Design a binder for these strands. Structure first.
Ligand SMILES: C[C@@H]1C[C@@H]([C@H](O)CC2CC(=O)NC(=O)C2)C(=O)[C@@H](C)C1
Ligand SMILES: [Mg+2]
Ligand SMILES: [Mg+2]
Ligand SMILES: [Mg+2]
Ligand SMILES: [Mg+2]
Ligand SMILES: [Mg+2]
Ligand SMILES: [Mg+2]
Ligand SMILES: [Mg+2]
Ligand SMILES: [Mg+2]
Ligand SMILES: [Mg+2]
Ligand SMILES: [Mg+2]
Ligand SMILES: [Mg+2]
Ligand SMILES: [Mg+2]
Ligand SMILES: [Mg+2]
Ligand SMILES: [Mg+2]
Ligand SMILES: [Mg+2]
Ligand SMILES: [Mg+2]
Ligand SMILES: [Mg+2]
Ligand SMILES: [Mg+2]
Ligand SMILES: [Mg+2]
Ligand SMILES: [Mg+2]
Ligand SMILES: [Mg+2]
Ligand SMILES: [Mg+2]
Ligand SMILES: [Mg+2]
Ligand SMILES: [Mg+2]
Ligand SMILES: [Mg+2]
Ligand SMILES: [Mg+2]
Ligand SMILES: [Mg+2]
Ligand SMILES: [Mg+2]
Ligand SMILES: [Mg+2]
Ligand SMILES: [Mg+2]
Ligand SMILES: [Mg+2]
Ligand SMILES: [Mg+2]
Ligand SMILES: [Mg+2]
Ligand SMILES: [Mg+2]
Ligand SMILES: [Mg+2]
Lengths: 205, 51, 100
RNA sequence: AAAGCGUGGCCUAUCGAUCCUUUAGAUCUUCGGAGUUUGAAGCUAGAGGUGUCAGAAAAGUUACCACAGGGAUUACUGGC
RNA sequence: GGGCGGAAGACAUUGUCAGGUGGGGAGUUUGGCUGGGGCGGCCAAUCUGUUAAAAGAUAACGCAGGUGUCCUAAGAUGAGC
RNA sequence: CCGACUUUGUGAAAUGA
RNA sequence: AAACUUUAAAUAGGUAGGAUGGCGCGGCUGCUUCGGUGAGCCGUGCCAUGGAAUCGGGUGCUCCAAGUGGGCCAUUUUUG
RNA sequence: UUGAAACACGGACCAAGGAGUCUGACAUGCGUGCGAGUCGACGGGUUCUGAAACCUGGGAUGCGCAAGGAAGCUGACGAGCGGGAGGCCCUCACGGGCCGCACCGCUGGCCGACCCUGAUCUUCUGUGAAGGGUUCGAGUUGGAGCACGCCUGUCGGGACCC
RNA sequence: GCGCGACCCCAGGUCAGGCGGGACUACCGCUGAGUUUAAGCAUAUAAAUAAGCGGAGGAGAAGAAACUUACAAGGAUUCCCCUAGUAACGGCGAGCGAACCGGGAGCAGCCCAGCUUGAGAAUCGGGCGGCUGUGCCGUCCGAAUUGUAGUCUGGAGAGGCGUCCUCAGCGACGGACCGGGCCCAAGUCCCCUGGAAAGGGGCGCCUGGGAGGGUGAGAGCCCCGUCCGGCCCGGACCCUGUCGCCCCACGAGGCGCCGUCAACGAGUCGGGUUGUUUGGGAAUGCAGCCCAAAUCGGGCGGUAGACUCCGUCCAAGGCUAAA
């Protein structure tokens, strides 16, 4: 090594020329995926091309906790309260995720509105030709059915930037927000030291 | 025997230009289509085109 | 239980959502012993007998030296969590054989 | 008494990196689900030592020898 | 007489750990300076005087020598001599 | 080379608990 | 008398030869003094014929980097 | 090589092949686009010669816009001076004054680490009016950065060739 | 002086059947180096690689949480981007180095064992026979009660009540996908050089066809071809499109309630020690030996330890395209 330069981190001491992966087939995968999507669309005509319905859920992880995304499936609670049986939901284009847990009414009603919307704008062909059973749909509106393409129920990733204009009140000015914000940090630090003295306060007195 | 430093498939074949720089270049090319002296310099026989 | 404080840092920090009580699931009874499995295990227990270290546990408990009872039970089984409850189970066997 | 003198020896030599261990100190910081609580991990300042002393952990032989080289380098001749 | 005939016998032995021995064997090293190298020595850290040519710097396996310590006083201060 | 655990079961005595 | 010196060359060595100076006035100081006594600074106003000779645009500032790190000859001083 | 015509080594001659290339990271310099932004690079839709081209997302993906600490954590409360390009004003002009970018030098302030300090207020352990520091920062008191290309250099890869 | 039944094991050129070897790109398992780098070298690195030994398919492997996380939490597997040359690991030297989150491609979840016909093996195979023939049916043997079929799989489930809601097959005709064959525009006009006109001049034509190739020299128009499509033949079809006859139940499912049961995989987990491996650090996986479970329990929450609480999942059986 020589004149002032970063300390190298070349991870090329193995036989990397046996494992170079080149991307010359990138246009090829694009075109093959496109072909596969056409031939799935024609087969699942007239089902929606995005597939079954997906829930609005929150991400994990402090960095993205506020940013909603499509999940994997509706929970059993949600299907039950929207009035759609467990074994029937995957049939009619509704995913089911028996592993999720509903921890909030805010989440449950948010997805219940999606179940109701999907059932509102859902059409179901009869299993046979003339026999129209319960849960079916009438021929007169069956006859205009199309294959919706793309995302038919979009999810907003963050709540919209809205900044209204309001009064600045006197008791709002008096609020020492930093002092507030240090007090609970102090309490979190002292949480053990407080409860210990409480424990022996009970144990002795 | 070999060639020196044999040619390898993982050269940089495709180079990248900024999307906005492509757009700027297409703007300059469209502008240059409009100037009769530029077309005639560039090698097109235009002595009878109307406008 | 009750929701977060709504303040980004501190005791019970986080963002406020009206929390919910989960319906009972299967696998919350996971491990809850049942009538017939208890019947089976209790029956087979005396038919098979007691493993030798478990007999040593019985001896040390009926002497009353619970510390060494736990110690040898731990050295046989492997971890304190299961040594403790093995000692509890064998103390149960000694109360149910000194009951009569 | 005071001015002052005193940050070792009247002055010029008499000594020591990284990692590891160990000690001193804060009623210090972390063990990342939350606490009590041993242990461990830190920060600052010392010691444990490298004498080849800017600091690898290290015995010979080859006349059975080998490869790279050297006329930077010996033995023969030549030269002063 | 439901024991093929003897012997040894829960000891040898089998497997896993544990310690010692183990150039039989493996892997590896075997510093530098140097009027060639080797042996010698340290001119490898380092101090004083000289060489050093009256500022500083200045070499040789140049020269005469020194250092790996000793000290609760042989440190600090004051006083007297 | 030897030590322990294992295959490794049975009952008997003498010394320690 | 290289490891002696009172004295003590020549040659070479350092510094200075102004505009980055000086004076007056009124302000600050937690320094300093017995003290406007100093030391230093700050604002302001005045002066300062360029303060020896000669010569001339400058590494003046910065960056990136090559090669080199075996030297040899000569006059003088000089070690074995 | 200090030194080659050397009694130093290679070369009998001809023809053809023959030795600093490619890739990754980084950096300076230069060019282009945008510029507190900048990248569409993995995907998606298109694409009537096309592995091209064009469109799309990004509301936070990379880097940049905040740094100091080991960490818990905290996180810039708004700058003056000397010399200065250049412009301006006055004078007949010589000369004088004003504003003075860049850069250089000097002194500070603020953030943070460590130390020091402590009115009030407060959830009693927190805050922090005032005051700090021969300390330390790859800080701030200048937003200039991102992407692409080229050369050069360092390093990893056969890595100039034998 | 026996005839019996079971077990276990023989021999059969018995009847019917499956195995072995080959190819190496990619894929799965074991085994497993050093040259090199560290300016030496011994841990490290090369590398969990090359070589060795095996096993498959059109893909293989994985796969439906004994997961991550600490969030407002999410939710099988696989791959790409980012995470990230980062946390960590390392004679803390050389170097080495993942994961969560997020965005995308594609997304499908399933079935067993166990308590559960006991008026009653309801199950399966084989020989023979028939027919409509990848099967169905009858008869006779055998397997099997040391358990075949059915119900169940934790998201549950089994029971009991209920208005209720949901289930069937066979034809035709295409489309779609695949292969193959045939066909398809226009100068060879006049002059000149030329061995040869495919060249030059002149007069013209095609073009949804000026890709390419042949033909005696730079051929759109001589030829095969290219564009537009047309026609016909054959396949697999098991995908859907509409027509037609066949009319869906007292069985099963779904939904609502109940509260009673609620059965869940062992030398396995788990622990010690050793070895290897990892980024995994008081130990990441695996493996050997020893110890060896639990049912108000068990595995995790990236620092060993005990107590309290909390978040989370249910292993030790199996199948599963797509990217
Ligand atoms: C007895 C101990 C030995 C030595 C140290 O352990 C050797 C280390 C240091 C080093 O160079 N890297 C290593 O891996 C070895 C040290 O520090 C001394 C003070 C005292
Ligand atoms: Mg003093
Ligand atoms: Mg003294
Ligand atoms: Mg002194
Ligand atoms: Mg030391
Ligand atoms: Mg933790
Ligand atoms: Mg040295
Ligand atoms: Mg040797
Ligand atoms: Mg011999
Ligand atoms: Mg040897
Ligand atoms: Mg030598
Ligand atoms: Mg010698
Ligand atoms: Mg001199
Ligand atoms: Mg001198
Ligand atoms: Mg002088
Ligand atoms: Mg020579
Ligand atoms: Mg000669
Ligand atoms: Mg030579
Ligand atoms: Mg020759
Ligand atoms: Mg951005
Ligand atoms: Mg200025
Ligand atoms: Mg290179
Ligand atoms: Mg290599
Ligand atoms: Mg090496
Ligand atoms: Mg080397
Ligand atoms: Mg070597
Ligand atoms: Mg191989
Ligand atoms: Mg498979
Ligand atoms: Mg980064
Ligand atoms: Mg590795
Ligand atoms: Mg034709
Ligand atoms: Mg012609
Ligand atoms: Mg042709
Ligand atoms: Mg191995
Ligand atoms: Mg291990
Ligand atoms: Mg599988």
């Amino acid at each position: 090594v020589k004149h002032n330069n970063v300390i190298p981190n070349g991870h090329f001491k193995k036989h990397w020329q046996n494992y170079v992966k080149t991307w010359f087939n990138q246009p090829a995968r694009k075109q093959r995926r496109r072909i596969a999507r056409q031939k799935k669309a024609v087969k699942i005509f007239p089902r929606p091309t995005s597939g079954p319905l997906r829930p609005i859920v929150q991400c994990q992880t402090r960095k993205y906790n506020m940013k909603a995304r499509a999940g994997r499936g509706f929970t059993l609670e949600e299907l039950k309260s929207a009035g759609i049986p467990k074994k029937l939901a995957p049939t009619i284009g509704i995913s089911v995720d028996h592993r999720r847990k509903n921890r909030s009414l805010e989440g449950m009603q948010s997805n219940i509105q999606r179940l109701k919307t999907y059932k509102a704008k859902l059409v179901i062909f009869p299993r046979r030709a003339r026999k129209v059973k319960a849960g079916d749909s009438t021929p007169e509106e069956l006859a205009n059915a199309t294959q919706v393409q793309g995302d038919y129920m979009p999810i907003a990733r963050g709540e919209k930037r809205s900044v209204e204009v309001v009064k600045v009140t006197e008791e709002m000015k008096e609020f020492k927000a930093y002092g507030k914000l240090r007090v609970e940090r102090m309490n979190q630090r002292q949480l053990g030291a407080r409860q210990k003295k409480a424990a022996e306060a009970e144990k002795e007195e | 025997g070999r060639m020196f430093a044999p040619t390898r498939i993982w050269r940089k074949w495709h180079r990248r230009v900024n999307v906005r720089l492509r757009r700027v270049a297409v703007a300059s090319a469209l502008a240059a289509t409009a100037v009769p002296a530029i077309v005639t310099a560039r090698g097109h026989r235009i002595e009878s085109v109307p406008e | 239980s009750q929701p977060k404080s709504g303040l980004f840092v501190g005791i019970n920090k986080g963002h406020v959502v009206t929390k919910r009580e989960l319906p009972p699931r299967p696998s919350d009874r996971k491990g809850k012993g049942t009538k017939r499995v208890h019947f089976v295990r209790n029956l087979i227990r005396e038919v098979a007998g007691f493993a030798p270290y478990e007999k040593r546990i019985t001896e040390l408990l009926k002497v009353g030296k619970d510390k060494r009872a736990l110690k040898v039970a731990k050295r046989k089984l492997g971890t304190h969590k299961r040594a403790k409850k093995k000692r509890e189970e064998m103390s149960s066997v000694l109360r149910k054989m000194r009951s009569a």
